Write a protein that holds these residues in place. Structure first.
Motif, PDB file in Angstrom:
ATOM      1  N   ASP A 138      -7.929  -1.569   2.325  1.00 27.21           N
ATOM      2  CA  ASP A 138      -8.758  -1.332   1.150  1.00 27.21           C
ATOM      3  C   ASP A 138      -8.306  -2.289   0.053  1.00 27.21           C
ATOM      4  OD1 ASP A 138     -10.353  -0.083  -0.965  1.00 27.21           O
ATOM      5  OD2 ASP A 138      -8.512   0.998  -1.492  1.00 27.21           O
TER       6      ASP A 138
ATOM      7  N   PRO B  51      -2.463   5.807  -3.285  1.00 26.78           N
ATOM      8  CA  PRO B  51      -3.870   5.626  -2.924  1.00 26.78           C
ATOM      9  C   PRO B  51      -4.775   5.279  -4.114  1.00 26.78           C
ATOM     10  CG  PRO B  51      -3.451   7.954  -3.350  1.00 26.78           C
ATOM     11  CD  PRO B  51      -2.201   7.174  -3.788  1.00 26.78           C
TER      12      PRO B  51
ATOM     13  N   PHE C  98      -9.323  -4.507  -3.460  1.00 28.72           N
ATOM     14  CA  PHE C  98     -10.178  -4.583  -4.653  1.00 28.72           C
ATOM     15  C   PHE C  98     -10.949  -5.916  -4.613  1.00 28.72           C
ATOM     16  CE2 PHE C  98     -10.867  -5.835  -9.061  1.00 28.72           C
ATOM     17  CZ  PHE C  98     -11.098  -4.651  -9.759  1.00 28.72           C
TER      18      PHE C  98
ATOM     19  N   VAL D 223      -3.794   3.081  -6.745  1.00 31.90           N
ATOM     20  CA  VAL D 223      -3.549   1.768  -7.322  1.00 31.90           C
ATOM     21  C   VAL D 223      -4.270   0.785  -6.408  1.00 31.90           C
ATOM     22  CG1 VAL D 223      -1.766  -0.006  -7.638  1.00 31.90           C
ATOM     23  CG2 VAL D 223      -1.399   2.339  -8.486  1.00 31.90           C
ATOM     24  N   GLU D 224      -5.114  -0.061  -6.997  1.00 31.74           N
ATOM     25  CA  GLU D 224      -5.902  -1.047  -6.260  1.00 31.74           C
ATOM     26  C   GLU D 224      -5.047  -2.262  -5.947  1.00 31.74           C
ATOM     27  OE1 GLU D 224      -9.069  -0.931  -5.325  1.00 31.74           O
ATOM     28  OE2 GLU D 224     -10.035   0.591  -6.580  1.00 31.74           O
TER      29      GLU D 224
ATOM     30  N   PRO E  64     -14.768  -7.334  -1.184  1.00 29.73           N
ATOM     31  CA  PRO E  64     -15.307  -8.146  -2.291  1.00 29.73           C
ATOM     32  C   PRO E  64     -14.559  -9.463  -2.343  1.00 29.73           C
ATOM     33  CG  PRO E  64     -14.829  -5.882  -3.026  1.00 29.73           C
ATOM     34  CD  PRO E  64     -14.203  -6.051  -1.657  1.00 29.73           C
TER      35      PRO E  64
ATOM     36  N   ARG F  24       0.834  -1.203   0.000  1.00 35.17           N
ATOM     37  CA  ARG F  24       0.000   0.000   0.000  1.00 35.17           C
ATOM     38  C   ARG F  24       0.877   1.265   0.000  1.00 35.17           C
ATOM     39  NH1 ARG F  24      -3.642   1.280  -2.652  1.00 35.17           N
ATOM     40  NH2 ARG F  24      -5.073  -0.281  -1.735  1.00 35.17           N
TER      41      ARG F  24
END
Lengths: 393, 393, 393, 393
Positions: free
Chosen positions: B238, B210, B240, B212-213, B262, B205
């Motif tokens: 966070d 912030p 994806f 780029v997933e 997800p 990360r």
């Protein structure tokens, strides 16, 4: 107690080949299994060849460890041909383990529960119709169908299993559209199929008399619609089971719910995971377990699972003597045993290939008590019967 | 328009081999596909070799006819390695069909819906950690993990996918117990796994910034208990997606129901039949479809099925350029497309093996418009890179 | 390859009109479809007129792109007349695409799987009773019903479909309260209905002999209560299917669960989404797919969906020659094909309206191999048969 | 009391047209309704034109008889544009019936239950952003969004509804991929969407203060995956409802089960049959009922159905004054009323088109007590505003 080698061998079995795993330990003990590629399973030898490489150097005693490892290494493509490879190796490990401990394989499986196993004479008269070059007398009409059933009765067999045959449209022939003979991929069932099923089973019943049970195997030859049509047509018949292979647990359950006959299935399934949706759906009266495909240890897990659902199981046994003996040891140990399949029609050279032949008395298989499965393939004889370039393909 | 031959070829790809189907028609058109044995799939070549024999003499135009027939001939052992064999042949047929009609393969698939496909850079930094002999710069610590994410950002990629890494227990190494590295078949998750996942993702990360997933692939490396532990530990991140392969639709659904991220799955599944129990259980936010395994035509059936459940799909793409192009054509035609996987780390000889390389701009793959998939393996180059005796095994 | 225009045409078809989409590309290729407003569908032309405006300027090759876009623009009022408009355009696009590539439409659909399609002779003797001004010989009593079945048998048709007829209450007339003829909106079934159904089917069976299958279409003419009454009354009859349209998946499933006959349904449904609740409920033996309404590409998605449930499908085909040819191409490509509907009664001017007529041999439709669907409407002939101001309304 | 004529009229409404049914009885009473084609509904006029022909000569008093008949005549293609046609006619019949009895329409609906109806100001600031040519002051940035909310507060409105807006990527614009603006048919939600939703709602809350409720309408602009992402991002916001249209009852239910906000849906649905699967799945906190589409009588059936599930309902009201008055009468009679939608932004010529305008006091709509709906379209004014060739298309 290390595994020193894992090899495969193959020989002619008429319209298909027999295949074997041969596993040798550092003590010189040899464990054997039998497996098959012909029943829609190309690639099994390749799987065994790759997996056997990981096994050399490991303990012959640690079969569930090898299973756990093999399952991991092949996790993404598990089931089918991969799981058949695993199962064949498992069955060879069990043989070698039993022999190392000087006990019949059933002694690894909870000990025996019974000394003899009731059988049904399978592919009867299927194989006399389909493979008359190898089994006799040939069956070419309804009279012959009746006479085959009479023979089963005379020989003291208590049950016989047949398939779908077309009698009134040229020479007697099998109806196997689920396996593309003929290629009619919708698998519809029409009047011709229904009328011929009736004619065939009437002939069989006539020969069987009233105390020989008749099993009907539909394999993958219809969709639920067609199976229902079959069951309704045959509602008046006395059938030990009607066997229907399906990858739709809800569709098979629907069929069973409207069946006036016991329904059997599952002969192509692998592991508790694949059986589970069928049992959860009330899909079957009887669960068929292919211990050659699954491996006998995995098959014990399936049988206990079925037992909790109060479902009895029947092994799938339609290859050579070694497969019969593998299944015999399974059948000896399983409490919830419906019946065992066997083939009474045998190849002219069948006995030559193995040290021991299965023994039947009064329609039952006698469970042997030799170390291991109860018979060994004979290397010299295997080589006297070189394989062909068979089965469904 | 008859198929004259079906051959397989193989070449070195570093820690695994690439495999190809080469299909020639009576007109001299050559259709190609790419397939794999390394990802737990020994036997696929054997399947293709047997099935290809039935195909010679048939129309190259009739791919669903060949599918229907092959499915029948292998019905009992369908799925897994058998279905991979079928899929590889299907993909070669589609190439040859498209070329015969002088159109890109997407023209057989409903026509294109988009000109460019957003990608994620997969196995990032997984492959720089695991295969530093083949990809650089090597990644050996948390700083390197951060720098890899920075590189992805600099290069305009919008998303990256990593796996599970252990950073505080000797040299940086992958944690892959689902594939027996290490052999710990219970697949338990402990504090060490959780702390290292956190450390690794924090580093990633930090480098990603912030916008780029980050995708996290857990593969088959836990049981539901352990996946839940992972999700709870990482609740504040966070992501994806979190990708979890499972053969328990109800267990995966339970996991998803408690996930603050997800959930994706299904990359190992074959056909609508195998996807169905997952969709019925609400098991996934995103369905991964392996079109190399399934065949692209079968994959279109899966994508429409997912679409009816309002689930978007992502192709599984982690082999050579031809596989990328196969997936590119699929991605061009599917409306419900989540994102496409690709590998940005490439072998020093990758471009040599194929006539054309995939082209990326601003984090998207440009869909080619040449007849067929968009690239052909080069026979001479394949032979300059003889295979090794790889993958999970 | 741009679409230059999308037009609709209409002509007299006796008691209803035929409608057509005519789509022209920049190359001068013309793609056609056939659609209908009479079967409860006012407004379809309006939908096509509006949607066709968005299509001009787009690639003729990108049919699924147009579908995706049209579906978005009409999302709130999807299904029904809107989806019929979309489907008609889709079918015209497919024709033009196939013609552009110089192939029969089945070549866009996976290639053909069979050369001939078994049919049933639909609306038999329905149309000779209801539309004697247009089809002969007129049928006005039970003897005529028998003779119609005899004719079907003589002509080598293997199956026929009839509807509900009242024979003992004045002149022979159809019982269609689901469509307000008569207006009795409760749709109750009484003894009169049941006795007349029996009388009608007995007459039909008498003429059909034992090898012609009889299908019974109940349309929307009862509630579950009444369907059950019908099934119980007719329990002793041999029916290929009993067809029941319903918007209650659970009510239809209840009916099927108590049916001694195969149940078919779904001819009015749109997309996998609408079929799904029926399949999930075990509602049908056979799924009818209206490819004229859905569009053939969407219909391939439905057929694959049905296939995963081991359900066979039958196209709905009861309009002009072009609709027959559209359905012929679908039927050629779908593996899980139950049977295909067709009308053997034809309008005196039917052949005039189209360049080619469908060809039947031994109760099967011969699948043509011309570029596109296999027949084109003739503009001059359409204009020689100006439409009327028809159908259910 | 016979219906003598059924006509449709249409006029300009800026970016869309208004449509009306005008129904005249033998006594010279005129009943009106308002309907729409712009919201994805081409063909509604055609439906009304055909159905109106069957109505002439029938009693104006017998509206449910006409419904029953129309439903029969259009049974196969029911829902969508067909049901909209039926609904428009129903609403005109109800007006004429009420006027014939000299009572407000709520007197046909169980009598009134309340004198005033709380509203929310819908499309706020949606319409000032999207249609600044017609409504002012224009809104072009976050400050304007805040000021719009301030205005609502100043004007004593208690609630406002907004949609999805992109603020940081060029000029302020709506994000409506569910309706193909932009064409991105996967409907994926990315960081940009999420960040802009947050920015937009923060601005709105800032202006709204703490006692004005904010409703968020997502329409059909994501898949379940994306809705969940939205809900999680916005978990900290205080939202009266989040509105999500979906044709997946199980997917919407999954979304609601993970929602920290009340979920509303159903504004596009027709009849108890279509609402039922959503209520059975626990899919919604609030059911939106489009009484313009359904017809008010059918809508009373839906409201009672919702009431049995302890679900409150809200009418969908986003057309002209007549639609407001239609919805006002519904709202007056329904016990389980959540709130009523209305548009406070009005066209410069809106008042000219109708005899009476809706009256609001202290954020509530005052229910009128004139015979019929409470306002009549003015023929001369309709003709002073000729329609354009609008809406989603």
């Amino acid at each position: 107690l290390k595994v020193v080698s894992v090899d495969t061998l193959c020989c002619d079995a008429g319209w298909r080949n027999y295949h074997f795993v041969k596993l040798t330990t550092d003590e010189g003990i040899v464990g054997w299994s039998e497996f098959d590629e012909g029943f829609g399973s190309p690639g099994v030898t390749a799987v065994i060849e790759q997996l056997g490489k990981r096994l050399v150097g490991a303990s012959v005693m640690e079969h569930e460890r090898f299973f756990a490892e093999a399952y991991c290494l092949t996790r993404p493509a598990t089931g089918g041909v991969v799981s058949e490879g695993i199962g064949a190796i498992e069955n060879a490990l069990l043989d070698a383990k039993a022999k190392t401990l000087n006990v019949p394989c059933y002694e690894l499986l909870g000990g025996k529960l019974r000394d003899r196993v009731p059988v049904y004479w399978s592919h009867c008269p299927t194989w006399r119709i389909n493979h008359p070059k190898f089994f006799g007398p040939p069956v070419t009409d309804l009279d012959g169908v009746k006479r085959t059933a009479e023979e089963a009765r005379e020989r003291q067999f208590r049950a016989i299993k047949t398939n779908i045959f077309i009698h009134d449209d040229g020479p007697l022939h099998a109806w196997r559209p689920g396996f593309a003979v003929p290629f009619q991929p919708a698998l519809n069932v029409d009047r011709k199929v229904l009328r011929n099923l009736r004619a065939h089973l009437e002939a069989l019943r006539d020969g069987a008399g009233p105390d020989v049970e008749i099993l009907l195997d539909l394999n993958f030859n219809a969709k639920p619609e067609g199976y229902l049509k079959i069951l309704r047509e045959l509602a008046d018949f006395d059938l030990f089971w009607v066997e229907i292979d399906s990858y739709s647990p809800q569709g098979l359950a629907y069929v069973r719910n409207h069946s006036p006959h016991p329904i059997s299935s599952c002969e192509t399934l692998f592991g508790i995971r694949e059986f589970k949706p069928f049992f959860d759906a009330n899909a079957v009266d009887v669960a068929i377990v292919d211990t050659i495909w699954n491996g006998v240890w995995q098959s014990m897990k399936i049988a206990a699972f079925a037992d909790a659902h109060d479902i009895n199981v029947a092994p799938h046994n339609f290859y050579g003597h070694l497969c019969t003996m593998i299944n015999a040891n399974f059948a000896a140990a399983v409490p919830n045993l419906r019946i065992m399949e066997t083939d009474i029609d045998r190849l002219a050279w069948e006995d030559e290939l193995f040290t021991h032949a299965p023994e039947y008395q009064n329609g039952e298989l006698i469970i042997p008590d030799r170390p291991g499965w109860g018979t060994d393939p004979v290397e010299e004889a295997i080589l006297a019967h070189p394989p062909k370039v068979g089965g469904l393909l």
